[PDB]
Every structure is written in C-alpha cells, then in structure tokens.
Amino acid sequence: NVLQIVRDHWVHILVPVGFVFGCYLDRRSDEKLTAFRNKSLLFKRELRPNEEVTWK
Amino acid sequence: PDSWDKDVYPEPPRRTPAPAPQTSLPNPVTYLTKIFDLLVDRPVTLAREFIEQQHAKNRYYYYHREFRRVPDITECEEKDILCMFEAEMQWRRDYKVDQEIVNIIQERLKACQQREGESYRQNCAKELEQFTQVSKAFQDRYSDLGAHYSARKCLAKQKQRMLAERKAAKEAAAA
Amino acid sequence: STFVAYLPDYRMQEWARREAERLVKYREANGLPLMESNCFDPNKIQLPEDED
Amino acid sequence: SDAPPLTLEAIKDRVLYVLKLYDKIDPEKLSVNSHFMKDLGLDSLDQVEIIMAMEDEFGFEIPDIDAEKLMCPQEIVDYIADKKDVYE
Amino acid sequence: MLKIIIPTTMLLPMTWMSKHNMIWINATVHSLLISLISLSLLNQLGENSLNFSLTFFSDSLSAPLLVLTTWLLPLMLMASQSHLSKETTTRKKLYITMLILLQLFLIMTFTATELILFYILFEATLVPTLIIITRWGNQTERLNAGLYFLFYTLAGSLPLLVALVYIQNTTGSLNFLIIHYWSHPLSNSWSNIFMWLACIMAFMVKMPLYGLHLWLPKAHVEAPIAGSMVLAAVLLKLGGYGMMRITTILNPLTNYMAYPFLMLSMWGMIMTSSICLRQTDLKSLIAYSSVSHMALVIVAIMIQTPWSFMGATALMIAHGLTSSMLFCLANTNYERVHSRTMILARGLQTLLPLMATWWLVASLTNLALPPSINLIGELFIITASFSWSNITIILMGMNMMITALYSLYMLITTQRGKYTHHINNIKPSFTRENALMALHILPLLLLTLNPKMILGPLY
Amino acid sequence: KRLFIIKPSGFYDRRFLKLMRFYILLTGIPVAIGITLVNVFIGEAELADIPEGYVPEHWEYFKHPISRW
Amino acid sequence: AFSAPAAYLTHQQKVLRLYKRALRHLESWCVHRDKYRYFACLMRARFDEHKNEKDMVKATQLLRQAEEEFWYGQHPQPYIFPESPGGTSYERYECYKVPEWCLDDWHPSEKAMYPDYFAKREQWKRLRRESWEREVKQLQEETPPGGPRTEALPPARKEGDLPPLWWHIVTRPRERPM
Numbered sequence A: 001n002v003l004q005i006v007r008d009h010w011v012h013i014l015v016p017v018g019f020v021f022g023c024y025l026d027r028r029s030d031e032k033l034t035a036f037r038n039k040s041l042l043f044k045r046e047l048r049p050n051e052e053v054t055w056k
Numbered sequence B: 001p002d003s004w005d006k007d008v009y010p011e012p013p014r015r016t017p018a019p020a021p022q023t024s025l026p027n028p029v030t031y032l033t034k035i036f037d038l039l040v041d042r043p044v045t046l047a048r049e050f051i052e053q054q055h056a057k058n059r060y061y062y063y064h065r066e067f068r069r070v071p072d073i074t075e076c077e078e079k080d081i082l083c084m085f086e087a088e089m090q091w092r093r094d095y096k097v098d099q100e101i102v103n104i105i106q107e108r109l110k111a112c113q114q115r116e117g118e119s120y121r122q123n124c125a126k127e128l129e130q131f132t133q134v135s136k137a138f139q140d141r142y143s144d145l146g147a148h149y150s151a152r153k154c155l156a157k158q159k160q161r162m163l164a165e166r167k168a169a170k171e172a173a174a175a
Numbered sequence C: 001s002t003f004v005a006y007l008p009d010y011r012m013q014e015w016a017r018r019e020a021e022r023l024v025k026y027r028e029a030n031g032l033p034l035m036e037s038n039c040f041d042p043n044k045i046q047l048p049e050d051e052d
Numbered sequence D: 001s002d003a004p005p006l007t008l009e010a011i012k013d014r015v016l017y018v019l020k021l022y023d024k025i026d027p028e029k030l031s032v033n034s035h036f037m038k039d040l041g042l043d044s045l046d047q048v049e050i051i052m053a054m055e056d057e058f059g060f061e062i063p064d065i066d067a068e069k070l071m072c073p074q075e076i077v078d079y080i081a082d083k084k085d086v087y088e
Numbered sequence E: 001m002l003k004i005i006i007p008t009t010m011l012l013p014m015t016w017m018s019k020h021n022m023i024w025i026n027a028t029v030h031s032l033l034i035s036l037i038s039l040s041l042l043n044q045l046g047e048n049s050l051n052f053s054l055t056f057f058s059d060s061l062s063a064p065l066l067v068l069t070t071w072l073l074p075l076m077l078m079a080s081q082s083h084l085s086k087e088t089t090t091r092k093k094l095y096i097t098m099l100i101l102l103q104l105f106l107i108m109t110f111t112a113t114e115l116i117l118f119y120i121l122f123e124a125t126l127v128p129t130l131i132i133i134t135r136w137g138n139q140t141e142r143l144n145a146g147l148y149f150l151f152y153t154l155a156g157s158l159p160l161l162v163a164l165v166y167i168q169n170t171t172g173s174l175n176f177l178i179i180h181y182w183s184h185p186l187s188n189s190w191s192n193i194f195m196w197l198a199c200i201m202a203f204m205v206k207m208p209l210y211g212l213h214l215w216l217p218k219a220h221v222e223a224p225i226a227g228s229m230v231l232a233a234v235l236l237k238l239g240g241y242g243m244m245r246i247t248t249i250l251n252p253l254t255n256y257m258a259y260p261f262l263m264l265s266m267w268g269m270i271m272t273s274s275i276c277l278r279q280t281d282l283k284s285l286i287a288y289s290s291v292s293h294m295a296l297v298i299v300a301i302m303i304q305t306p307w308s309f310m311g312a313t314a315l316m317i318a319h320g321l322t323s324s325m326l327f328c329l330a331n332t333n334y335e336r337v338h339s340r341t342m343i344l345a346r347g348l349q350t351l352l353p354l355m356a357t358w359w360l361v362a363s364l365t366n367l368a369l370p371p372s373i374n375l376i377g378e379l380f381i382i383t384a385s386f387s388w389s390n391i392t393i394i395l396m397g398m399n400m401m402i403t404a405l406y407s408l409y410m411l412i413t414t415q416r417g418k419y420t421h422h423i424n425n426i427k428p429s430f431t432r433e434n435a436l437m438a439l440h441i442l443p444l445l446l447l448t449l450n451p452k453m454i455l456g457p458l459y
Numbered sequence F: 001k002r003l004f005i006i007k008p009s010g011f012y013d014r015r016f017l018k019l020m021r022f023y024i025l026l027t028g029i030p031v032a033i034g035i036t037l038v039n040v041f042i043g044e045a046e047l048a049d050i051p052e053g054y055v056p057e058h059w060e061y062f063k064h065p066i067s068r069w
Numbered sequence G: 001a002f003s004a005p006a007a008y009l010t011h012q013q014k015v016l017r018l019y020k021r022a023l024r025h026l027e028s029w030c031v032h033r034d035k036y037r038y039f040a041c042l043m044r045a046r047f048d049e050h051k052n053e054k055d056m057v058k059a060t061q062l063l064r065q066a067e068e069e070f071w072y073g074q075h076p077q078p079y080i081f082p083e084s085p086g087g088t089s090y091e092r093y094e095c096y097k098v099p100e101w102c103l104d105d106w107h108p109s110e111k112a113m114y115p116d117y118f119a120k121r122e123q124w125k126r127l128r129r130e131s132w133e134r135e136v137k138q139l140q141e142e143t144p145p146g147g148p149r150t151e152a153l154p155p156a157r158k159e160g161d162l163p164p165l166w167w168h169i170v171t172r173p174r175e176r177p178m
C-alpha cells in the first residue's frame, strides 16, 4: 500500500531533516569555542564530584 | 502582606476611625457590605483555600542568581578585549539595577501622593526630596550618553565632571 | 503566542528588581545615599595631574 | 411601525381630494382623466400651483422637468406610483 | 542560526521535487513550520546579543526582523497562487524559488557578524527582487521600474563598499563586536565627512530618504503582489537595520552631519503625506504612505537616543505588517476589476462586508490608533524628537493629521457611497483572501499585549 | 406583505468565520485547560536561599513551571 | 429625473421655474399658512401683471431683474423636502440598495431557500435574453445616421416587443429596499 504514497509524499522529510541537521551543526560549532569554558572571572566554578564540563 | 519587604515599600500606621452613627436610619452601605461578604468574599476564600491546599502538596523553589564582582572598566588596559567584555557586562547589569532603584523611589512617590489626599504637598516632602537626590545621581551617571552607550563613555563623562569640579575647587581655594 | 508569553526571564528584570531591593534596604538602613553621582571609584582614576 | 404601503386607490383619492379643494376646478365636472389646460381651462401657473399642492400632499418634491407634463390627474397618479414603488 | 537556515535551503529541493499540483501546499506548510522554529530567537539574554558562532549572531534588534521575514513568506505564497494559476509548472517553481532565495538572503543579512558579509547579502537581495518585478510584473512599465530600483540602490551601495574596505584597513576588523568595543571618535575633517556620507547614503537610499525616493512608487506599483509585499514589509527595513548598526563608528560627527537628513525627512514626511491626498492610483497611495512612515524612522535613527531607537524598531515592525496588509487588500479589488484606479470601484462595503472590516482595521492601524504598536513607535519617536527640539511637535503634529486624512480618504473612496452600476463581476470573498487578511492582522493585535518583544536592544 | 430582500451572498464570509473560530479554538481550548491545570495543581515556585555548597541548574532560577520547562 | 432633457430651456420654462422657486422661498420666509397664502396671491398677481407682454426683449429684462431680486431676497436656509437633493434623508437608503446580479453569486444552499422567487427570476432572465436582439435592431432602425440627437428612447411597436433598454429601468432595487 505504502509504495507509491511514499513515492509521492517523500518530500515532506526534507525540511524536518534539514532542521535536525542544522541543530547538529550548531552543536558542532559550539564545540569549537570552548577556550574559556569555566575560565571566566564571573562564572568560574568548582566542578561537582562527578561532572566533567560546566557546559557542552 | 509579608510577601514584600515593608522597609523598601513603607507605609504609615494606617489610622482609621470607628463608626459613630448619629441617626436611627439604617446605613445601606454596611448592609451591602454584609451581602457582598457572604456572597463573594466567602466563596472566593474557599476556592483559594482549595487552591493553596493543592499548592502545598507540591512545593518547589527557585533561587535568585548571585553575580560575583569582576574588575571594572577603569582597571582594563586599552586593548584587552576580555577584561573590557566582562567590565562592560558588569556595567550594564549595574545600569539595570540603578534603573530599578529609581523605579522603587518613583513608586514610593506615587503611593504617597495618592495616599495623602489633600495634604500631599506637605505630607510627601521627604518622598519628593528622596526622589530628587536619586534623580540627580542617576542623571549624572547616565544622561547624555546616547544610544550606543558604554562603560567607556560613562567613564569619560565622569572624568570630565571630575576635571571641572577639581578646577572649580582649585580656583575657589584661591579665593 | 503561548510560547512567547511564557518565555523565561532571561532579560533579568526580576533579578534586577530583587537586586535593587537589596541595595535600597542596605543603603537606607545604614544612612547611605541611595545613589552616587560617580559610577566608578574616584580612587581608581588617575586624572592628569596639572590643569593649567 | 410606520405608514402602510401606499395603494394606487388611496393615491388617486388623495389627488382628487386636493383637486376639488382647488377653487378654479369644478368638482361636479372634474374627472381622473380631465386635462388641466384643455378641459378645465387653466394655464401654466395654475398647473404649477397644482404640482406644488401635490408635493405638499405627498411630502416629496417633484422635479420641474418631469412636472412640465403632468397635465391630468391620472398622470400625477402614475408619477407618484412609479416614484414610490406601488403596483396596486 | 544553522537550525533556521538549513530547512529554508531545504525548501528549495522540496519544491523542485514536488508534484505539479502540490507545490503551494508543500511550500506553505513548511514555510509556516520554519516561522514557528524561528519564533525561538525572541529569547534574549539582556546585557548582550546571542552569539551562535563567529559568523552569525542574533540581537533584540534582529530577532523581530527575522520573525517578520519568515512569517511573510507563507503570506506571499497565499497571495501569489491566485494570479499564477495559468502559469506552467516550471515557471511556478521558479517563482517560488525566487521567494525562497530572497528569504534565505534576508535571514543571513540580519545575522551576519561582520559588515562585508552583511554587505554581500544586503546586495544579493537585489537579484531575486529584480527578477520578480521584471518577469512577473503585469505592466510594460515594470522594465523601467526595475532599472530605477537597481540603479538607485547601487549608486548608494558602492561607496559603502569602498568605505568598508578602507575602514577594515585602518581598524583591522569589520566584526561588529570588535567595531563596537574599540570605537573611537570621528574627527571633524573633510576625509571623515566623506567617510560618514559613504557609510550613510546606501542605507538612506534603502529607506528611502525623501528626494531619493523616486524608485519606490515605480517599483512597488509595478511589482506583482508578493514582490510588493516583500518590498514594503522587509526590504525597506534593511536601511534602518544597517543604519542602526553603522552609526556606532560615526560619533561624534553625527551631531551635525545629521542636520540635512533630518530636514529632508521631516519636510518630506509632510510632502509625501500631502501627496497621498491627491492620488488616482490605489497602490501609489500605499507606496507614498510607506515613504512617510520611513521618514519618521530616519529621524528616529539620526537623533541617536534610546527612546528613538526603541520607537524606530517598533515602527519598523508595525509598518511591515500594516503595509503588507494594505497591499494585499488593494490587490483583491484589482483582481476583481483589473484596474488600479481608486474611483473605478466604489461602495464595495455593500458588496463585500467582511473585506470592508479588514479595510477598516488596516486603515485604523495605518493612522496609528492606540494602543497599537504603530502608535507606540510613533509616540516614542515623537517624544525623543521633542527632547531633541520642542519645535518638532509642529511638524510631527501636522503629519499625524494628514495621515488620518488620507487613510480615511482611501477607506471612504473605496468602501462607501454607492457601487459603480456597470461593474457586475464582483464575486464573494474567497476563504484564501480572508485568511490572508486575518494572518496579517492577528499578529499585529497580539503584539500589543507584549510590546517589549518588538522594542529592541535598548529596552 | 413579506418581500424578498436582495443581499449579496453571506455564505462565504460566514463559512470563513466558522472555520477560523474552529481552528483557533481547536488548538486553544486544550492550551487554556492545560495552563489552568498546571497553575492549580503545580503552581509557581517560592523564593529560597541557595543551600550550602549547592549549585542550582539554570532553569531553577525561574518561578513559573511553564517557563521553567 | 425620468424625462430626457432638451438642448435648452425656453423663456416660458425659465419663467415657470422662477415662479416655483419664488413661491417656495416665500413659503420659507412666511412660515404660517395664512400669511404665506396672502403673500403668495400677491406674488401671483405681481407675476400676472406682465403676463401678456409681446416684446421679447422687455420680457427678458423683466425676467433678469426678477432673478436678481430673487437672489438678493432668497432664504439662506429654504425648506427642503427630506429626500430631496439637499434634504436630511436625501441618500439615506443608498447603502441598502443591492444590484440584482448579486443574486447569481449566491450559494446553492442560499437559493434552496426561496425556490419560487428564483424560478420566477429564471423566467425574467429568459425574457431579457430573448428580447435583447430585437431591442438592438429596433434601436438601429429608428435612429438617424448621425447618431441619436436626444436621450429619448422609443417604445415597443410590434406584437411581443419590449421597449428597448428596459432591464435596468424595470429592475431598479427599490427606494426602501430593506
């Protein structure tokens, strides 16, 4: 049943997939700007007994 | 109620007189007040009681955020962008807090003018003087900065004022 | 519209109000001026020494 | 509510009423088909006074170009009827 | 910022691979979805802008503009699909592609971190707009309009390019944050005077400033409906946004370089409002009204106060919504009677009552009825101007009167009186048109409840 | 006597208004009921001091449950 | 309103119109019925004084100076019948007049109500469609080669003919349409 309706409605995945991919690339871009993570005079903090980073 | 600090938002002891009837006629206001009470204020109070019963079951809190004190713009050297950034953010937060201080004082002034009735011109002089002091200080700090204001422009304004005041005092000492 | 109506206070106006409340309480509890015409400490400023 | 819809019959009774209240017209010899100038012996000024009486009657003004030609009571009835949208 | 941008790009192949009878449905659905996602940029930190990355950032100045762009795209699609019904599938896809490319260029321009990227995108917006006007424009006059729109814009923007590269050679950077933190005063010299002019004239011609405004009646009148919508709602605001950004490196020179532009904008406010009173074309009237509103925005930006910047932001947003609504309203009647003359069709309230309600509401927001955001912006600008000089009230007061006059004149001429006897092809309003009007109007009214969102960075 | 009143067609405006009301309400009645249920059963948080050595999460600085979420 | 105008007014028409205007303005000045009746008879007499003048030039000058007198002595606020072109109800019901062609755009559900009215309307439309060509041909027959000379239209002359250009005169909305 679903063959040809997939073949005629598959275009409805392009924009949600682009949204997900953009969120992913924004996270990857964030991963490049960590030079001052937990290093600012205003927010520098002592790590909790188990946490690794103050933000990801 | 106790929710807000009565030192920041003060009000006088609230003297109200006792009813001294002078006639045999019934006062329709008090009867209307009993009717209003027993038709409106009791159902509303019961509804609020139930709502707060449901509130107490699930009690959670939030915390006011506290900010350290970082070096200001005076102790940042000329091209150090990180010290400048943190100093500018701190100056902006202080500007916001000063706006809110002026807001509190203005609220006091307005509440006094309304409360004192026909005697506001004499009974609200302290509120007026307090506003005048706060307004003068706020004006010196931030007026004429313009849009695109910054901590550096506020510092330049302060320094210009300090130079003028120093020179005035110096030529007054020669008098 | 609902999402925009319930946006968290990232503009920090509640925080600013509470901060001003603390400051006003402390300052007129101690008899200090509500605000100072100098935004920055005059001891951290080094004006040019001579003016004539 | 307001006035009942006009009926040609009430119209024509009213025009005849005003016409026999006119001193220059013989009542016992006026008909709904009587020509003003030709049968009743009037001139243009009499006819003008007659249209003005008709507007005073029915409370609405008649244009001069249209009136020039209302030369018998039936023509006045037809004019008023077609103006006020009465079919019966 | 990538999360908003990639889906917009995705819209491109989604429309190129869609079935011939589903292009409008698909584009509208996913445009609306993109608009919803964008809605999340309105959360602003306070002290500073949100810097997503080195290349993109969002501001409180920026967030309102982006949401308006993304929201305007589906409305343009709804307005277009009627007069484009006879078109081939490929040309319909090309038209939608033009609209999508325009949205993509606009989103990037508002969020670019540095001026050279802002300049490139701000100039790239010219190509799709020109193609839309000259290819889908109804009249012969569209070709002339396209030339006017192109040349007026480039004659301003090329000196800006020279000035920008010179500024980066002398300062070392064009990044807006570095530009702001390392700002130094502009001396009073001939070199600095011409640098100021080269930094300002492009945005002046985009607004448009009075006397450099002649391209706008041509281009806005000869364009198809979606072209006119995007030209009035968003493309005029590029000048305001760019000026608000660029005036940080221009102090203290602006104190006296602003005088002729303030004089032009105030007097030309009066002039274009008066022009609206004797206009035989209905689109021409809406165009000149836009000019009058943008003159107010120019004054607000030139006087450089926090209240004036807040008023300018609010007025930009409100104008963008109201002007698009007015253009769509005029286009419905044009679709009926195939003429732009205002006295051709009269007494339309007797034939189309709900459309008359839409007309009344659009005319009421155009004259800035309280407490609409049009009046919020106008009132804030008027107060700042009063502080600047108390004599501005006379000009401001006069403008308010003439605006009420021509707004209600348009309403009365098109909706009231008796219908033209001969025209008998005025069919009932379609659901599409009513929904388009509501989707313009509901957002404006909703904005009154939360004024701070459209207020800007100064707030 | 009852005459016919010549009016333009009111079917299409009425249908548009019914459709708009229908969709607005379709999604906005559940939101109103949900906000009421949250406000009544969950409620806002109360201001408290930051306990010793504790560090709150970023969302624990706001009081309304919907804003917190 | 209903009659085709002529190229000009004759001396007689001008005189009658001035008579009517003078009488109406005199009634405006003379509020009460008896006093107006008296002065209107005096007016009619003063009007009849020059009734049988044969010199056209002196009659024209009499008319001219009479018009000057009327203009100097007119009422600044004459009585107007309420639905007349200056009346307080002049165009009051124009917002209620809807053209009949709007009825064809009605939804079928709207025409489901009123079936008899719409059947009779289809009959009227058939009548107009079957009369149009005869109307056009008749107008072309009865009209001089150099175009028409006045705005007058001929009646029907044959058996089942209708007067040419009748549809928008017969199907006027109404004068109290709601």
Ligand SMILES: CCCCCCCCCCCCCCCCCC(=O)OC[C@H](COP(=O)([O-])OCC(O)COP(=O)([O-])OC[C@@H](COC(=O)CCCCCCCCCCCCCCCCC)OC(=O)CCCCCCCCCCCCCCCCC)OC(=O)CCCCCCCCCCCCCCCCC
Binding pocket: B043, B044, B046, B047, B051, C001, C002, C005, E442, F020, F021, F024, F025, F028, F029, F031, F032, F035, F036, F037, F039, F040, F043, F044, F064
């Ligand atoms: C429409 C169709 C056509 C199209 C038209 C265009 C439509 C376009 C719409 C576009 C979509 C818009 C979406 C916007 C969403 C915005 C939502 C939002 O912002 O929520 C805000 C806000 C949310 O509250 P919150 O800040 O989150 O909560 C704070 C607290 O924690 C909370 O406090 P709490 O928890 O203590 O309170 C308890 C709780 C519940 O309270 C209670 O249960 C108790 C209440 C007291 C009752 C006491 C008496 C009752 C019991 C007595 C009898 C029984 C007991 C006795 C029995 C025995 C007797 C012997 O309170 C509530 O839940 C209030 C209801 C909230 C409803 C919000 C609805 C938003 C809908 C959004 C979508 C829009 C869809 C539109 C259609 C929706 C359908 C209408 O809700 C309100 O603002 C409600 C307003 C209340 C106003 C009170 C009256 C003030 C009037 C003064 C001004 C007027 C003066 C005169 C003016 C001038 C006249 C001349």
Ligand SMILES: CCCCCCCCCCCCCCCCC[C@@H](O)O[C@H](CO[C@H](O)CCCCCCCCCCCCCCC)COP(=O)(O)OCC[N+](C)(C)C
Binding pocket: C001, C002, C004, C005, C006, E039, E064, E065, E067, E068, E071, E317, E443, E446, E447, E449, E450, E454, F064
């Ligand atoms: C036709 C029939 C008419 C009759 C029927 C009328 C029915 C009633 C209509 C009137 C309703 C009045 C409602 C009044 C508002 C009540 C709620 C209001 O207060 O919400 C506001 C908030 O409104 C929203 O902010 C509106 C946001 C704007 C919506 C945008 C829609 C999506 C964008 C669409 C495209 C936009 C393009 C332009 C972008 C710039 C302000 O909330 P606030 O006082 O703080 O709340 C305090 C407590 N909180 C904060 C916890 C909630």
Ligand SMILES: CCCCCCCCCCCCCCCCC[C@@H](O)O[C@H](CO[C@H](O)CCCCCCCCCCCCCCC)COP(=O)(O)OCC[N+](C)(C)C
Binding pocket: E188, E189, E190, E193, E210, E211, E212, E257, E260, E261
């Ligand atoms: C139709 C819409 C078009 C857009 C509008 C464009 C507006 C551009 C106008 C520019 C505003 C002012 C330009 C420069 C500011 C002052 C100009 C000058 O006249 O002022 C005096 C300048 O003195 C003399 O006037 C010299 C200039 C005279 C020569 C210029 C020719 C002006 C004729 C008008 C031509 C129209 C130009 C626009 C073309 C369309 C000031 O004395 P001074 O303190 O010593 O000079 C200050 C500069 N210093 C400090 C470096 C020394």
Ligand SMILES: CCCCCCCC/C=C\CCCCCCCC(=O)O[C@H](COC(=O)CCCCCCC/C=C/CCCCCCCC)COP(=O)(O)OCCN
Binding pocket: E151, E152, E153, E154, E155, E156, E159, E162, E163, E166, E190, E191, E192, E194, E195, E197, E198, E199, E201, E205, E212
């Ligand atoms: C659609 C119509 C728009 C028209 C806009 C035209 C006006 C644009 C503004 C002026 C354009 C040229 C400005 C040059 C770009 C700035 C570069 C700069 O600032 O460098 C200056 C150089 O300044 C100049 O050389 C500019 C001189 C002008 C040359 C071209 C003249 C063109 C016409 C000028 C007047 C028109 C401008 C306003 C017209 C507005 C439009 C009506 C200083 O550098 P140095 O050479 O190193 O000097 C210090 C070291 N010795």
Ligand SMILES: CCCCCCCCCCCC(=O)SCCNC(=O)CCNC(=O)[C@H](O)C(C)(C)COP(=O)(O)O
Binding pocket: D043, D044, D045, G011, G012, G015, G016, G022, G025, G026, G029, G046, G047, G048, G050, G051, G052, G053, G054, G059, G060, G062, G063, G066, G069, G070, G073, G074, G075
């Ligand atoms: C207060 C308001 C102001 C009032 C001031 C007005 C002043 C008016 C003074 C009097 C005006 C004159 O005498 S005006 C003098 C004009 N003289 C003539 O017309 C003489 C020739 N007569 C004819 O042509 C016809 O007999 C004719 C008379 C038309 C009748 O015709 P019928 O019988 O076939 O209808």
